[PDB]
Amino acid sequence: MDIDPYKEFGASVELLSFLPSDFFPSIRDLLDTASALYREALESPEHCSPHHTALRQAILCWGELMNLATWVGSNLEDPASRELVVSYVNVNMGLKIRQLLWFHISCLTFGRETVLEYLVSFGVWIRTPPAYRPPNAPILSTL
Amino acid sequence: MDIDPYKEFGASVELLSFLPSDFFPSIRDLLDTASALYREALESPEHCSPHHTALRQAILCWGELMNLATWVGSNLEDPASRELVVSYVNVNMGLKIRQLLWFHISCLTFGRETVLEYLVSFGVWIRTPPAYRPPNAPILSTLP
Amino acid sequence: MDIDPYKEFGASVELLSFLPSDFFPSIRDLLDTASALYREALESPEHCSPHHTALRQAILCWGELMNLATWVGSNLEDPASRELVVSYVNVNMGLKIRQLLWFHISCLTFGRETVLEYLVSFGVWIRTPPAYRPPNAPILSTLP
Amino acid sequence: MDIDPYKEFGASVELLSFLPSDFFPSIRDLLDTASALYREALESPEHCSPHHTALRQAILCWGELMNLATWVGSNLEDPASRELVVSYVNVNMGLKIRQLLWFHISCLTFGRETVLEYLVSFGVWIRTPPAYRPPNAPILSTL
Amino acid sequence: MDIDPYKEFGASVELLSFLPSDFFPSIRDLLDTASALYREALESPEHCSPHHTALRQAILCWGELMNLATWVGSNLEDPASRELVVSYVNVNMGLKIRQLLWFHISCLTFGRETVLEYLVSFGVWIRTPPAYRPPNAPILSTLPETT
Amino acid sequence: MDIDPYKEFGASVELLSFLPSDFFPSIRDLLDTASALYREALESPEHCSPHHTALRQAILCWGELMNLATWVGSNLEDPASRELVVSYVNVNMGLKIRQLLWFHISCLTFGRETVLEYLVSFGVWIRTPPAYRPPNAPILSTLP
């Protein structure tokens, strides 16, 4: 079956594909801003928010992916083949978990209606050619 | 942060450790149960339950892991180290979503309080010495 | 004084003698059931039930017996008489807390009246001649 | 898991660790004052008190420890190794069952609020050096 | 800043200097006393008293001093100069917080005015010559010695 | 007894480790602004705040640590121990006293909620890639 993870939150993969690769902070920097803002709500028996439920799964999805890269570096025989796998988890599979971590942290920080309104205006900006756009990208921090 | 995937739903990792490792059905058998029973709701544009939201992320977590096992199939021309990676995803990494898929499919079908009471009742069954346990295990089939 | 540990809870030593000796699960299997199900309450600063108060003393009684078996491990340099002591605590002394841990975990999970009725119902089952008893024993799994 | 046996009664192991070893009577003298004061309440099907439930377990804990020392003296081969075990049950494991027997007998005799108020004032007295304390320890017998 | 830890609570350093140096119990004996009676309050998410706010920093002051003495042991390969620093942390720096732990535990247990009247009455007792001094020193027990 | 020094003030060690380590002003500058702004209120027979009660103990803790450093500089014959100990006391304990002094001085100056919001905002600002944040770092300021 075909599930996009954002459709229950009012977005799509097509809406978040306009953000470039160097728009999201690193995965260590998304896990730090969740552990420092919402830790008593993520380590809680309550449901709190639907953005809290999807953020708990995205953290433990990465904790098993960092569990994989520790296994790959420990018990593969040749070092040549193991350097493609750990580079795949951090870069290729790590990019999909950044925008999952970015979307749910920002929907808790700024609001869900603000992030969806920002993703429209960022899509207009990056679809415009660089000669006909303002030089600075729009930012989020309304608060 | 030591975050618990089942504490939100009134369970724990140590309560899910009452069931053995080779008790959960395979991932292909659990994704067909999700397809046949809950496909209009997992593809719905609204979250219907907290179990649906944790189940949509559990399928995409396995979908990311199947793009990985396809990638190690197409790459890593050393053949002896390719089979170490793709069998790790299918066996070792596939287990921790297999408890995650089993817990959320069964809590959508039978309810929260039925699966939590089944987790205790399977705890009594596997604890009993083999001279005094029944030959049948408990099944979640509360429905006729 | 000939004091009865289960008479307070509506049972007796001779009603607990309906179950055989090798029916109760091991002490490591019963302390994990107490850990997974009742750890906020056994470490609570208030007594929640008379079964909690008798269960906190049953765990500390085994905790005193494990400091003893560690002490006979570190001391008693005669090796033939060290193994007589530590196997007595694990097998012989560990049994009378194993009925004590089983009775209070099961009475917190299923209730008093369910375990007392299970003690009678297991009495009928073990009494029946083997030509006419079922191949299944009763389990306390009243919960689905 | 980590349980202290006194926390449900409003005390701790840290509160009762200030009482010295020679503060409690012998285990035969704690079992005599329970069998002579509360025997119709300990040999009873009722719950009576939470101090009664914890006292029933502490008596039968010692009855299995005296069962052990009878076994050790009967069927160990050498007498040299058996004299360390029976001295361990009576002294080392016997000291932990004295303060369990003392705390629950005294909470029934004087009251729970009196024993906790006495354990504070006995802690002030024995933490004071002997040159700056009164020479007599405080006593319990308010009745 | 000529600042004073007890001046806020109605005392002084010199009023705490009535008690001698070898009067306060050891740091292990006040940490066991604090954790016995005040552990849900010293780890509470709110401040309960100015004694609780000042006792949380005094335990944290001792915690930073014990990670220091641990660090001097794992490092500092000269044994002649290592042991005199760990001795300075334990017996010299620990004395200034033993008065801080004793003062704030006792004002939580018996009250501010009871400890402040005890410091005066122990001041009369210790400056009396030993020929005219009574045998039983003052003590801030809430119960009498005969109960 | 595990006590968080900022827990009663609505923060934690994790929220103050959210900012980088070389952000907090030095211990000399923080004691300078404490002695400039709040000296008649820290040398006072009143409490006036929980922040004043914590700031006095922080200043006295740093005074005891500087007495320690003066003592180690006074009498230790090993020159490498004078290189190790008083550099540890500065660069490892002064960072924690820098966070404590900065937190309490800023909470006295700007308010507690403004300092907590500034902690969250500056952490998320540092974490953000530089092309998608405001170009200059935020400060607390009382000047309109």
Residue numbers in the entry:
A (entry chain B), D (entry chain B): 1 to 143
B (entry chain A), C (entry chain A), F (entry chain C): 1 to 144
E (entry chain D): 1 to 147
Task: Quote the passages of the study that discuss this structure, keeping the authors' original sentences.
The roles of RNA sequence/structure motifs, Packaging Signals (PSs), for regulating assembly of an HBV genome transcript have been investigated in an efficient in vitro assay containing only core protein (Cp) and RNA. We propose that they act as Packaging Signals (PSs) helping to ensure faithful encapsidation of the pgRNA, by analogy with the mechanism regulating assembly of many bona fide ssRNA viruses.
After data collection, 127,410 T = 4 (84%) and 23,257 T = 3 (16%) particles were chosen for further analysis. A homogenous dataset of the remaining T = 4 particles was subjected to icosahedrally-averaged refinement yielding a ~3.2 Å resolution map. This reconstruction reveals a Cp layer similar to those seen in previous EM and crystal structures. Density for Cp chains is complete up to the start of the ARD.
